[PDB]
């Protein structure tokens, strides 16, 4: 499969999450995603075929994971935006007020602004701290997906949101949305990963 940020993959033939970013760890290919999406050694599939397994994760506390891929996978420096693509150029962290977009398999590509950093989400499993909040909308299934600026700077991966009864927070004004993502930089340094860029 071609590994592009934002696309669907399943975990052990049951949950769905979205690909965050293509990365490498030495000769190993992988992608970063959300920790709550799978446990270590869970099987990741893209379009019915096995692409790799969860190599490491931390959830709750943090919400991060990376999946090591078989070498048949093609890592691409891109994030899906409809039929188009946003090229990944690096991971400079944007400040509050900066505009940002996110990509995932439920709601597609959505944009908004970073509204706060170092937010704690209190999920049923336990607290996840240190998250950044934006007001781009998102829905169940978008977890693990790319948050990136239009300029191509990778910000992080989707963690959670104030989901409404329709499965997303796209039907409430931006002012009322809390969509939270896990910062990319601590994930890259914790697993010694390098981002694929173009």
């Amino acid at each position: 499969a071609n590994i592009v940020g934002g696309i669907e993959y399943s975990i052990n033939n049951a949950s769905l999450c979205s690909v965050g970013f293509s990365v490498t760890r030495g000769a190993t290919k992988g992608f970063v995603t959300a920790g709550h999406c799978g446990t270590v050694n869970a099987t990741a599939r893209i379009g019915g075929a096995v692409v790799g397994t969860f190599a490491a994760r931390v959830f709750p506390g943090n919400d991060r994971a990376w999946v090591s891929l078989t070498s048949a996978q093609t890592l691409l420096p891109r994030v899906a935006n409809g039929s188009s693509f946003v090229t990944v150029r690096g991971s400079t962290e944007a400040a509050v007020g900066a505009a940002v977009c996110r990509s995932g398999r439920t709601t597609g590509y959505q944009c908004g602004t970073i509204t706060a950093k170092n937010v704690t989400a209190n999920y049923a499993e336990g607290a996840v701290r240190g998250l950044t909040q934006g007001n781009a909308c998102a829905g169940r299934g978008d977890s693990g997906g790319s948050w990136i600026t239009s300029a191509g700077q990778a910000q992080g991966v989707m963690s959670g949101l104030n989901v409404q009864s329709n499965g997303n927070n796209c039907g409430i004004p931006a002012s009322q949305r809390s969509s939270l993502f896990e910062r990319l930089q601590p994930i890259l340094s914790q697993y010694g990963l390098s981002l694929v860029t173009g």
């Binding site: 709550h36 209190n122 998102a138 959670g160 949101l161 104030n162 989901v163 809390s178």
Partner: peptide, 4 residues
């Protein structure tokens, strides 16, 4: 907020 809930995971996703």
């Amino acid at each position: 907020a809930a995971p996703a």
